C-alpha cells in the first residue's frame, strides 16, 4: 500500500521491478503495465487463493492498484532478494559443488511442490515460463521460483483444468518442442508439467557450466547461445528444437567430476523430444537427495 520506491533494479517485457520500503524494510515491487494486466491478475490470483508458501517459491506480501504519473499502476509486492536472479547471479560468480547442488536442489523442490496437489492444501500448478531470469537467489543460498503469471492449475477432486485467459506465451528460447510445433495437448494438465521439466533441463545446463571442477568452468551462456540469436523468434526456435532436434552440448570436462556427470544424466532425461519420457519434478528432486 503506502510504500516508498527507492531504486528500480531491472526491467523485463511486462514491467519494472523496484526495490522499495514498507515499514522501513526491503520489498520487491513489480509494477505492471496495464498492457499486461492479465499477468498481474493471474499472479494475484494464485497468491491470494492458494496457500503458496514454501522455502523455494517467491514469498508474496500484497497486491494492489495505485495511481502514479496520472495513470493506474498494478503492484505485486514480494520478498526482496538482494542477490537478484539466478541469471544475473550465474554471470558474476562460479560455483563449487556444495553451492551448485544447493541451487539445483532448491529449484527441484520448488517445482515439485508446485507440480503436486496437496489435500487439506493446494491444487497442482504448472509454471509455463520457467527460466534462469524467473528464479531468485536468496541470502541463505536457496533459490526460489517467481513469476506465476502464466500458471495453470488442476484439482484432482474436480478434475477441472484452469488455464486462464492470458494471451502471453512463454519465453521463446525455453519452449519445449510440443509448444513450438503447436501439437501440445491443451486439455491435459500433465502436458504443462512436461513443458516445465524441459525448461528445467535447460536451466540445469546453465547452472552446471558454472561449477568449478578441476579449476575450469565454462562462461555463462544461455541455452542455444550458439545456434539462435538473442531475442530469437518463434521460427528460429522451431528449426533448432523441432526439426534438427538439437540439445545443448555437454562439455566433457564434466566427465572429470562425479556430480557434473549426474547432472548431465539428469538434463538429457529432461529434454527427450517425447514429453512422456521426461522425468517428473518428483524424481529429479529425489535423485538430488
Ligand atoms: N523479488 C525480486 N527481488 C529482487 N530482484 C528481483 C525480484 N524480481 C525481479 N527482480 C530482478 O528484476 C529483474 C527484472 O525482472 P522481470 O521484470 O521479472 O523481467 P525478467 O523476469 O527478468 N524477464 P521477462 O519478464 O520475461 O522480460 C529480474 O531479472 C531480476 O534481476
Ligand atoms: Mg519475471
Ligand atoms: Mg523475475
Ligand atoms: Mg512471482
Ligand atoms: Mg507476471
Amino acid at each position: 500500500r503506502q510504500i516508498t520506491l527507492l531504486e528500480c533494479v531491472g526491467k523485463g517485457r511486462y514491467g519494472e521491478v523496484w526495490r522499495g520500503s514498507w515499514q522501513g524494510e526491503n520489498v520487491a515491487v513489480k509494477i505492471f503495465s496495464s498492457r499486461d494486466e492479465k499477468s498481474w491478475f493471474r499472479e494475484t490470483e494464485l497468491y491470494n487463493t492458494v496457500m503458496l508458501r514454501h522455502e523455494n517459491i517467491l514469498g508474496f506480501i500484497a497486491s494492489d492498484m495505485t495511481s502514479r504519473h496520472s495513470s493506474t499502476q498494478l503492484w505485486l509486492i514480494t520478498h526482496y532478494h538482494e542477490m537478484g536472479s539466478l541469471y544475473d547471479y550465474l554471470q558474476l560468480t562460479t560455483l563449487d559443488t556444495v553451492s551448485c547442488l544447493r541451487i539445483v536442489l532448491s529449484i527441484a523442490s520448488g517445482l515439485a511442490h508446485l507440480h503436486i496437489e496437496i489435500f487439506g492444501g493446494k491444487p497442482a500448478i504448472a509454471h509455463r515460463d520457467l527460466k534462469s531470469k524467473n528464479i531468485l537467489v536468496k541470502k541463505n543460498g536457496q533459490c526460489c521460483i517467481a513469476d506465476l503469471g502464466l500458471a495453470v492449475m488442476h484439482s484432482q477432486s474436480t478434475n477441472q483444468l484452469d488455464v486462464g485467459n492470458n494471451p502471453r506465451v512463454g519465453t521463446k528460447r525455453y519452449m519445449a518442442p510440443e509448444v513450438l510445433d503447436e501439437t501440445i495437448q491443451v486439455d491435459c494438465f500433465d502436458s504443462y508439467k512436461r513443458v516445465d521439466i524441459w525448461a528445467f533441463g535447460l536451466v540445469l545446463w546453465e547452472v552446471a557450466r558454472r561449477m568449478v571442477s578441476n579449476g575450469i568452468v565454462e562462461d555463462y551462456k544461455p541455452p542455444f547461445y550458439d545456434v539462435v540469436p538473442n531475442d530469437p523468434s518463434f521460427e528460429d526456435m522451431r528449426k533448432v528444437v523441432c526439426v534438427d532436434q538439437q540439445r545443448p552440448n555437454i562439455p566433457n570436462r564434466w566427465f572429470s567430476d562425479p556430480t557434473l556427470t549426474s547432472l548431465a544424466k539428469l538434463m538429457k532425461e529432461c529434454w527427450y523430444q517425447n514429453p512422456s519420457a521426461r522425468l517428473t519434478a518428483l524424481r529429479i528432486k529425489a535423485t538430488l537427495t
Side-chain angles (χ1 to χ4, degrees), residues 2-34 36-138 140-155 157-159 161-238 240-264 266-267 269-282 284-289:
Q2 79 313 231
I3 262 83
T4 357
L5 280 57
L6 292 333
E7 48 155 317
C8 173
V9 307
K11 287 201 193 203
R13 307 158 278 174
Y14 315 107
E16 337 173 345
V17 184
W18 286 68
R19 183 191 67 93
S21 279
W22 177 59
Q23 267 286 311
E25 298 237 28
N26 273 283
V27 294
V29 175
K30 189 174 187 193
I31 303 196
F32 286 76
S33 35
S34 165
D36 300 305
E37 47 191 12
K38 280 162 170 297
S39 299
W40 174 87
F41 195 97
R42 192 52 158 194
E43 281 206 85
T44 304
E45 205 187 12
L46 274 84
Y47 281 130
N48 269 111
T49 67
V50 170
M51 196 158 43
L52 221 31
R53 310 94 65 78
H54 188 281
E55 184 69 48
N56 314 119
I57 287 166
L58 179 58
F60 176 80
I61 301 197
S63 199
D64 205 26
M65 310 200 174
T66 194
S67 209
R68 266 167 178 70
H69 309 138
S70 79
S71 261
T72 164
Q73 294 196 342
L74 309 172
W75 292 22
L76 181 78
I77 295 111
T78 66
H79 293 162
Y80 183 74
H81 290 313
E82 302 185 311
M83 311 159 53
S85 77
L86 185 54
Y87 171 89
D88 293 326
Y89 186 70
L90 284 191
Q91 242 143 337
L92 298 191
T93 325
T94 37
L95 304 157
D96 83 82
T97 32
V98 60
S99 55
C100 166
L101 289 179
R102 186 182 339 285
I103 283 156
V104 302
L105 188 50
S106 45
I107 309 170
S109 298
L111 194 58
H113 175 254
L114 285 171
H115 270 201
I116 66 200
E117 166 154 29
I118 313 309
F119 303 98
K122 73 173 268 301
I125 306 167
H127 189 285
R128 292 180 79 222
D129 202 356
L130 174 89
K131 72 183 166 178
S132 46
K133 283 149 287 146
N134 278 334
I135 296 154
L136 295 168
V137 183
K138 317 195 296 168
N140 60 79
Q142 295 269 313
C143 292
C144 61
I145 298 163
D147 193 338
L148 294 158
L150 272 177
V152 300
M153 299 176 292
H154 182 271
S155 303
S157 161
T158 103
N159 200 68
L161 168 71
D162 180 337
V163 288
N165 36 61
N166 201 334
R168 167 186 163 203
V169 294
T171 305
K172 298 182 166 56
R173 182 184 303 270
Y174 285 79
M175 281 173 182
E178 52 278 25
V179 185
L180 286 155
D181 55 30
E182 282 153 290
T183 87
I184 189 179
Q185 297 247 300
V186 181
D187 311 314
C188 167
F189 173 72
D190 289 42
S191 266
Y192 295 108
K193 274 199 291 200
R194 292 144 174 183
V195 180
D196 282 359
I197 302 301
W198 163 275
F200 181 69
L202 296 184
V203 179
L204 228 39
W205 180 88
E206 288 178 77
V207 188
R209 293 167 50 86
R210 301 294 294 147
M211 202 217 310
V212 282
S213 70
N214 325 128
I216 52 192
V217 277
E218 294 77 26
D219 307 317
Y220 168 79
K221 289 302 187 154
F224 304 98
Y225 70 100
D226 53 358
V227 288
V228 309
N230 280 36
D231 198 7
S233 83
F234 198 86
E235 298 80 344
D236 286 327
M237 292 315 302
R238 199 166 51 204
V240 168
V241 166
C242 304
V243 183
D244 309 271
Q245 322 197 348
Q246 299 179 61
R247 309 295 187 251
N249 274 299
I250 295 280
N252 48 280
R253 78 101 170 182
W254 299 4
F255 296 147
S256 294
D257 184 86
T259 68
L260 278 313
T261 308
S262 182
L263 306 179
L266 266 196
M267 290 160 214
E269 306 214 272
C270 300
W271 54 56
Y272 296 111
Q273 173 103 359
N274 191 262
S276 318
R278 295 173 199 152
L279 299 200
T280 65
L282 285 78
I284 295 168
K285 189 194 176 139
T287 66
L288 302 175
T289 300

